[PDB]
Amino acid sequence: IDGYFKIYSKHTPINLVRDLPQGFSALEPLVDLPIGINITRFQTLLAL
């Protein structure tokens, strides 16, 4: 947006086997990249 790529995050402790947990938690801003590229797709990177 507005000429940047912007990222927000938070990490939280859990104890569950499956599915996204209940409850509220607001993500804080992480980084604000001044990069002008077009984006329309993404893919996850994984460790074997």
Binding site: G3, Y4, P34
Partner: protein, 49 residues
Amino acid sequence: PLQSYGFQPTNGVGYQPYRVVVLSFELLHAPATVCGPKKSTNLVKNKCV
């Protein structure tokens, strides 16, 4: 197509070597990746300023 410069130190100043740097600045809607230092003042308190 290329010719070498012959720079002897005794050559006349028009034939002596000059170094050049050209700084090209672009102004756009794009984000400002470079800016000047905007040198700060001291900070003072409890006064209308």
